[PDB]
Amino acid sequence: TEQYAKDTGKNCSYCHQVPASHKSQPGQQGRDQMDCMACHKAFMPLTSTAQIPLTERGVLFMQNGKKLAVDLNYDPLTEANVVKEFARVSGLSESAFGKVSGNITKQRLAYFLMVALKAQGEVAKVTANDLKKYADYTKAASANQKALVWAVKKGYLSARKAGSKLYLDPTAAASRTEVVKAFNAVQAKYPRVLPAPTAYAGTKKCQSCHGFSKFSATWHPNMVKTPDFFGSMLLWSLNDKFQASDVRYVINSPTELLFVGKDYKYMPYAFDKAENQWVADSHTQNWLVSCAKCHVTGYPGPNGITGTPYSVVGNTYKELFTEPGIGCEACHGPGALHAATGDPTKILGEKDGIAASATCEKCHEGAHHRGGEYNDEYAIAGVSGTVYGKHGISLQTIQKNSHGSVSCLECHSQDYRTALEDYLKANPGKTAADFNATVKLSDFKLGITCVTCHSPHSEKGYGKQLRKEPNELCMECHTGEGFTATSGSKGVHHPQKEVFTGQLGASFTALGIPEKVYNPMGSAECVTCHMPNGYHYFKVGKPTISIDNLTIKNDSSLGSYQSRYKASYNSCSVCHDAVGFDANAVKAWTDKVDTRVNNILNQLKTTYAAAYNDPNYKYADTLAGIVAADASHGIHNTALTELLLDKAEYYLTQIPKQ
Numbered sequence: 001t002e003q004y005a006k007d008t009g010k011n012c013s014y015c016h017q018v019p020a021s022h023k024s025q026p027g028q029q030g031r032d033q034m035d036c037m038a039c040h041k042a043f044m045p046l047t048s049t050a051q052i053p054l055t056e057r058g059v060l061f062m063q064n065g066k067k068l069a070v071d072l073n074y075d076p077l078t079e080a081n082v083v084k085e086f087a088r089v090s091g092l093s094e095s096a097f098g099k100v101s102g103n104i105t106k107q108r109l110a111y112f113l114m115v116a117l118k119a120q121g122e123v124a125k126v127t128a129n130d131l132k133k134y135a136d137y138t139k140a141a142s143a144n145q146k147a148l149v150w151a152v153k154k155g156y157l158s159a160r161k162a163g164s165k166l167y168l169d170p171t172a173a174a175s176r177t178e179v180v181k182a183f184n185a186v187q188a189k190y191p192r193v194l195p196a197p198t199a200y201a202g203t204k205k206c207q208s209c210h211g212f213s214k215f216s217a218t219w220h221p222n223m224v225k226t227p228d229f230f231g232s233m234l235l236w237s238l239n240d241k242f243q244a245s246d247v248r249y250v251i252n253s254p255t256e257l258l259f260v261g262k263d264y265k266y267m268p269y270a271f272d273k274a275e276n277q278w279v280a281d282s283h284t285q286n287w288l289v290s291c292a293k294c295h296v297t298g299y300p301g302p303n304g305i306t307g308t309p310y311s312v313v314g315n316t317y318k319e320l321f322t323e324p325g326i327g328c329e330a331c332h333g334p335g336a337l338h339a340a341t342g343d344p345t346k347i348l349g350e351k352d353g354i355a356a357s358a359t360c361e362k363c364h365e366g367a368h369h370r371g372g373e374y375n376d377e378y379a380i381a382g383v384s385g386t387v388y389g390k391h392g393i394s395l396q397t398i399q400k401n402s403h404g405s406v407s408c409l410e411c412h413s414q415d416y417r418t419a420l421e422d423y424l425k426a427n428p429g430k431t432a433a434d435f436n437a438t439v440k441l442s443d444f445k446l447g448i449t450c451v452t453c454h455s456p457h458s459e460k461g462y463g464k465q466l467r468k469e470p471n472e473l474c475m476e477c478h479t480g481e482g483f484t485a486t487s488g489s490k491g492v493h494h495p496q497k498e499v500f501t502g503q504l505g506a507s508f509t510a511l512g513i514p515e516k517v518y519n520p521m522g523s524a525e526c527v528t529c530h531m532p533n534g535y536h537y538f539k540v541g542k543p544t545i546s547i548d549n550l551t552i553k554n555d556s557s558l559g560s561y562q563s564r565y566k567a568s569y570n571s572c573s574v575c576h577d578a579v580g581f582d583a584n585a586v587k588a589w590t591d592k593v594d595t596r597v598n599n600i601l602n603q604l605k606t607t608y609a610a611a612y613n614d615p616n617y618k619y620a621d622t623l624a625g626i627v628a629a630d631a632s633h634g635i636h637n638t639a640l641t642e643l644l645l646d647k648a649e650y651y652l653t654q655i656p657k658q
C-alpha cells in the first residue's frame with residue numbers, strides 16, 4: 001500500500017509486480033519508477049493485488065509481519081545478514097554456516113558461498129599447485145583457502161594482477177558488488193519457480209501471511225498424526241500386539257485414537273482417551289483406500305468423497321497427499337500460486353461461493369457424517385409426500401414470496417448476513433435498515449449454510465465450532481419479539497424463544513399470565529429434541545421418527561454411502577422412557593392441544609366473527625395464535641400452553657355476543 005511505501009521508503013515496484021509495458025530498462029525512466037497513483041488515480045484505479053501481485057520481496061515483507069526482509073542490495077554487509085539471506089535462498093540452516101560476527105570479508109564470503117552452493121566436494125578438488133598460482137593465498141585462514149580459489153576459478157570473486165603476481169586480498173572487506181554477485185549465484189542455483197495452478201502450499205504457509213493461528217487447534221488439521229506427536233502418553237509398554245514403529249498414522253478424534261499400519265490397514269487396538277487405555281477395535285479397512293480421501297489434503301483432483309489420495313504400483317501404495325489432516329486448502333483449494341503472489345483470484349473465497357454448504361458436504365455428506373442432511377429431501381416414514389429440509393430453502397422462500405424484501409434475509413440468507421455485518425464494520429453508526437438501501441433482494445444467492453452456524457476457522461468454546469451457545473443460536477432467528485396481547489393470529493410469527501422461555505412480554509401482564517412461566521421440560525435444549533445425536537434433520541420424533549434421505553439415496557457420487565440413506569432417532573428418551581413413552585402417549589397430548597386451539601379459532605371465525613375490533617376478542621385470538629405459530633403443539637412449554645388455552649377459552653365467553 002501507499003502506507004507501506006512510506007513506512008519502508010520503498011518503491012511500489014519493490015513489493016508489487018508491474019506490467020511489462022511499464023518496465024524500466026537500465027538507465028531508462030519507465031513507468032515502473034513513476035508515481036502509480038497520479039496516473040491511475042481515476043482511469044484504472046489500483047485497488048487489489050489481483051492487478052499488482054506481490055514480488056518475492058512483497059511476499060517476504062508480508063510473511064515477516066509486514067517488516068522488510070534482509071536485502072543484500074541495501075542492508076549492512078555483516079556476516080549475519082549474508083548468512084541470513086544465503087541460508088534463506090538455499091534452504092540450509094543458518095547454523096550450517098557456523099559462528100558469525102563482524103562485517104563480511106572476501107575470504108569468508110567465499111566460505112559462505114561454498115556452504116550455500118553446497119560445493120564442499122568441488123572445493124576439496126583443488127590442489128596445492130592451484131593455491132600457489134596466488135601470491136597471498138596463505139594470508140587466508142586455512143578454512144577459506146581452497147574456497148577462495150574455487151570462487152575465483154568459478155568467477156564468483158576476482159583476483160588482481162600486480163606485475164607477475166595475482167592477489168586474492170583475502171582479508172579485504174567484501175564490497176557490496178561482490179556480495180551481490182555471490183548472492184546472484186546462490187539465486188541462480190535455487191531459482192524461484194512460479195507454482196502451477198494445481199499445487200498446494202500447506203497450512204503453515206497460509207498462516208505465515210494471514211495468521212489464523214487458532215485454526216491449528218481445531219480438529220480438522222489434527223485428524224491424522226504420526227505416533228511421535230503423542231510423546232509417551234500412549235503407554236506403549238501396555239500394548240502387546242503392536243508398537244509405535246509398527247504404526248504409520250494415528251487417526252486423531254476428540255475421544256479416540258485409531259492406528260494405521262505400514263500396509264495402511266487399521267490395527268487391532270484403539271486408544272481410549274477418557275480411560276487412558278488400549279481397547280479392542282474391529283476396524284480392518286484399508287485407511288488409504290477407504291478413508292484418507294476425507295482425512296488428508298493436497299492430492300490431485302477433487303477432494304472429499306470422490307477423492308483419490310493414493311496411487312497403487314501393483315501392490316504397494318504411494319501417498320499422493322501432501323498434508324495430513326484437513327488444512328486450509330481442503331476448503332480454499334490449491335493455494336501455492338496464491339501463496340507466492342497474494343493474488344486473490346488464485347484462491348477460493350466468498351466470490352467463488354465458498355460459503356455454500358457444498359464446501360463442507362463433500363466430506364460431511366449427510367449419511368454417516370453429520371451436517372449434509374440439513375438441506376436434503378426427506379421421506380418421513382408414515383407421512384406421504386416428500387419434503388426438503390427447510391433451512392436449505394430459506395432463501396428461495398423469500399424469492400418466491402409476494403411481499404419478499406431485503407429485510408427478511410436477516411434470518412433467511414447467509415450471504416446477506418455476512419454482507420450486512422461487513423457494512424456495519426466499514427460504516428460504523430449505520431444501522432441494518434439503511435444497508436438495505438444499497439442492495440436488491442436479487443443480489444443474494446445463499447440460504448442458510450454450514451457456516452451460518454459453524455465457524456470454519458476456530459472453536460470459541462461452545463463445542464462443534466458453533467458461533468453461539470446452542471439455545472442462543474436457534475433463538476436468534478426463531479424469535480417473535482415485539483408482538484403484544486393485541487396482535488392476533490396473523491400477527492405473531494415463530495415465537496419459539498418466547499414460548500420456550502415462557503416469557504411472552506410485558507403487555508401480557510394485564511391478561512393474568514405471569515412474567516415468567518417456567519417450562520416443565522426447560523432442562524431440555526432446542527437441540528435435545530430437534531438434533532438428537534447431532535442429526536441435522538430438525539424433524540422431531542414423537543417420540544421416534546424414521547427418515548429416508550432421498551438426496552443420499554439418488555446420488556451415485558457417494559459410492560457405498562449411497563445405500564446408507566436411512567436415519568432413525570428418538571427425540572425424547574434422554575428424559576422419557578425409551579420403550580414405555582410411545583406415539584400413543586404423545587398423540588394424546590398433541591391431539592388434545594390441536595383440538596383446543598382449532599375450536600378457539602373456528603368458533604371465532606364463525607360464531608364470534610366480526611367482533612374483529614373488540615379489544616377483548618383480539619386477546620383470545622393472540623393467546624391462541626401463539627400456540628399455533630409456535631407450532632409445537634404446546635410441547636415447547638406445556639404449562640404456558642394450558643395457561644394460554646384456558647385464558648383464551650375464558651376470554652371468548654367474556655365477549656359481547658351478537
Ligand code: HEC
Pocket residue numbers: 357360361364370371372373374391448449450451452453454464466470473527531532533534535536
Ligand atoms: C452444513 C452441511 C453443516 C455441516 C457440515 C455441519 N453443520 Fe451443524 N450443528 C449445529 C448445532 C446446534 C450442532 C450441535 C448438535 C448437538 O448438540 O447435538 C451441530 C453439530 C454438528 C456436527 C457434530 C455432530 C455430532 O456428531 O455431534 C457437525 C460435524 C456439523 N454440525 C457439521 C448447527 C448447525 C446449523 C444451524 C441451523 C447449520 C445450518 C449447520 N449446523 C450446518 C452444518
Ligand code: HEC
Pocket residue numbers: 001002004005008010011012013014015016036037046047048049054057058059061062342
Ligand atoms: C512492501 C514494503 C510494499 C510496498 C513498498 C508497497 N506495497 Fe502495496 N501492498 C503490500 C502488501 C504486503 C499488500 C497486501 C496487504 C494485505 O494485507 O492485503 C499490499 C497491498 C496493496 C494494495 C491492495 C489494496 C489494499 O490492500 O489496500 C494496493 C492497491 C497497493 N498495495 C498499492 C501500493 C502502491 C501504490 C505502492 C507504492 C506507493 C505500494 N503498494 C507499495 C506491500 C507493499
Ligand code: HEC
Pocket residue numbers: 012013016017018019020021022031032033034035036037039040044051052
Ligand atoms: C502513466 C504515466 C502511468 C503511470 C505512472 C503508471 N501507469 Fe500503469 N498503466 C498506464 C496505462 C496508460 C495503462 C494501460 C496500457 C497498458 O500498458 O496496459 C496501464 C496499465 C496498468 C496495469 C494493467 C494490468 C496489466 O496490463 O498488467 C497495471 C496493473 C498497472 N498499470 C500498474 C501500474 C503500477 C504498479 C504503477 C506504478 C509502478 C503504474 N502502473 C504507473 C499508465 C501509467
Ligand code: HEC
Pocket residue numbers: 049054058059062063201202203205206207208209210328329332334335336338339340341342343344345347348349350351352
Ligand atoms: C502472502 C504471500 C500470502 C500467503 C502466503 C497467503 N495469502 Fe491469502 N491473501 C494474501 C493477500 C495479500 C490477499 C488479498 C487481501 C486479502 O487479505 O483479502 C489474500 C487473500 C486471500 C483470500 C480471500 C480471497 C478473496 O476471494 O478475496 C483467501 C480466502 C486467502 N487469501 C486464503 C489463503 C490460503 C488458503 C493460503 C494458503 C494456501 C494463503 N491465503 C496464503 C496474502 C497471502
Ligand code: HEC
Pocket residue numbers: 219220222223224252253254293294295296303304326330331359360361362363364450451454455456463464465
Ligand atoms: C474433508 C477435507 C472435510 C471438509 C471439506 C470439511 N470437513 Fe469438517 N471434518 C472432517 C473430518 C475428517 C472431521 C473429524 C476431525 C477429527 O479430528 O475428529 C471433521 C470435523 C468437523 C466438525 C467437528 C469438530 C468437533 O469439535 O468435533 C465440525 C463441526 C465440522 N467438521 C464442520 C465443518 C464445516 C462447517 C465445514 C465447511 C466449512 C467442513 N467441516 C468441511 C472433514 C471435512
Ligand code: HEC
Pocket residue numbers: 203206207210211212215216220326327328329330331332349350354355356359418451456457
Ligand atoms: C473449511 C473447513 C475451511 C478451512 C479448513 C479454512 N477455511 Fe477459510 N474460509 C472458509 C469459508 C467457508 C470462508 C467464508 C467465510 C464466510 O463466513 O463467508 C472462509 C474465509 C476465509 C478468508 C476470508 C476473509 C476472512 O475471513 O478473514 C480467509 C482470508 C481465509 N478463510 C483464510 C483461511 C486460512 C488462512 C485457513 C487455514 C489456517 C483457512 N482459511 C481454512 C472455509 C475454510
Ligand code: HEC
Pocket residue numbers: 251253254255258283285287290291292293294295304305362363364365368369370371
Ligand atoms: C468422507 C465421506 C469420509 C470418509 C470416506 C471417511 N470419513 Fe471419517 N469422518 C468424516 C467426517 C466429515 C467426520 C466428522 C463429522 C462426523 O459426522 O463425524 C468424520 C469422523 C470420523 C471419526 C471421529 C468420530 C468421532 O467419534 O468423533 C473417526 C474415528 C473416523 N471418521 C474414522 C473413519 C474411518 C475408519 C473411515 C474409513 C472406514 C472413514 N472415517 C472414512 C468423513 C469421512
Ligand code: HEC
Pocket residue numbers: 397398401403404405407408409410411412476477478479494629630631
Ligand atoms: C428472523 C427474526 C426472521 C425474519 C426477520 C423473517 N423471518 Fe421468515 N421465518 C423465520 C423463521 C424462524 C421461520 C420458520 C418458523 C416456523 O414457524 O416454522 C420463518 C418462516 C417464514 C415463511 C414460511 C411460512 C410458513 O411455513 O408458515 C415465510 C413465507 C417467511 N418466513 C417469510 C418472511 C418474510 C416475507 C420476511 C420479511 C418481511 C421474513 N420472513 C422475515 C425467521 C424470520
Ligand code: HEC
Pocket residue numbers: 388389390391393394395397410411412448452453470473474475476477478526527530531537538539
Ligand atoms: C437463521 C440463520 C436461523 C437459525 C440460526 C436457526 N433457524 Fe431454524 N429456520 C430458520 C428459517 C428462516 C426456517 C424456515 C425457512 C423456510 O424456508 O421455511 C427454519 C426452519 C426450522 C425448522 C423447521 C424445519 C423443517 O420443518 O424442515 C426447525 C425445526 C428449526 N428451524 C429449528 C431450529 C433449531 C433447533 C435451531 C438451532 C440448532 C435453528 N432452527 C436455528 C432460521 C434459523
Ligand code: HEC
Pocket residue numbers: 471474475478494496497500501521524525526527528529530539540541542630631632633635636
Ligand atoms: C422437546 C421438548 C423440544 C424442545 C426442547 C424444542 N422443541 Fe421445537 N418442536 C418440538 C416438537 C415435538 C415440534 C413439533 C414439530 C413436529 O415434528 O410435529 C417442534 C416444532 C418446532 C418448530 C416448528 C417446526 C415445524 O414443524 O414447523 C420450530 C421452528 C421449533 N420447534 C423451534 C424450536 C426452538 C427455537 C427451540 C429452542 C427454544 C425448540 N424448538 C425446542 C419439540 C421440541
Ligand code: HEC
Pocket residue numbers: 520521522523524525528529540541542543571572573574575576585586589635638
Ligand atoms: C428432559 C429435558 C425431557 C425431554 C428431552 C423431553 N421431556 Fe417431556 N417431560 C419431561 C418431564 C420432566 C415431564 C413431566 C413434568 C412434570 O414435572 O410433571 C415431561 C412431560 C411430558 C408430557 C406430559 C405433559 C403434561 O401432561 O403436562 C408430554 C406429553 C411430553 N413430556 C412430551 C415430550 C416429547 C414428545 C418429547 C420429545 C420431543 C419430550 N417430552 C422430551 C422431560 C423431558
Ligand SMILES: *[C@@H]1O[C@H](CO)[C@H](O)[C@H](O[C@@H]2O[C@H](CO)[C@H](O)[C@H](O[C@@H]3O[C@H](CO)[C@H](O)[C@H](O)[C@H]3NC(C)=O)[C@H]2NC(C)=O)[C@H]1NC(C)=O
Pocket residue numbers: 377386550
Ligand atoms: C427435489 O429436488 C431434488 C434435487 O436433487 C430432485 O430434483 C427431486 O426429483 C424428484 O425425486 C423425487 C423422489 O425423491 C421424485 O421422484 C420426483 O418425482 C417426480 O416429480 C417430477 C415432477 O415434479 C416427475 O414428473 C415425476 O413423474 C414425479 N413422481 C411422482 C411423485 O409421481 C423427482 N422429480 C423428477 C423431475 O424426476 C426433487 N423432488 C421434488 C421436486 O419433489
Ligand SMILES: *[C@@H]1O[C@H](CO)[C@H](O)[C@H](O[C@@H]2O[C@H](CO)[C@H](O)[C@H](O)[C@H]2NC(C)=O)[C@H]1NC(C)=O
Pocket residue numbers: 286289312314315316
Ligand atoms: C489395494 O488397493 C486396491 C484398490 O485400488 C484394492 O483395494 C486391493 O484389494 C485387494 O486386491 C488384491 C489383488 O490386488 C486381493 O485380491 C485382495 O483380496 C484384495 N483385498 C482384500 C482384503 O480382499 C488392494 N491390494 C492390496 C495389496 O491390498
Ligand SMILES: *[C@@H]1O[C@H](CO)[C@H](O)[C@H](O[C@@H]2O[C@H](CO)[C@H](O)[C@H](O)[C@H]2NC(C)=O)[C@H]1NC(C)=O
Pocket residue numbers: 515516
Ligand atoms: C424466578 O422468577 C421469579 C419471578 O417469576 C423471580 O424473578 C425469581 O428471582 C428470585 O426472586 C426471589 C425474591 O422473590 C429471590 O430474591 C431471589 O434472590 C431471586 N433470584 C435472583 C438471585 O435473582 C426467579 N428465580 C430463579 C432462581 O430463577
Ligand SMILES: [Ca+2]
Pocket residue numbers: 361365366372373374375376551
Ligand atoms: Ca445435503
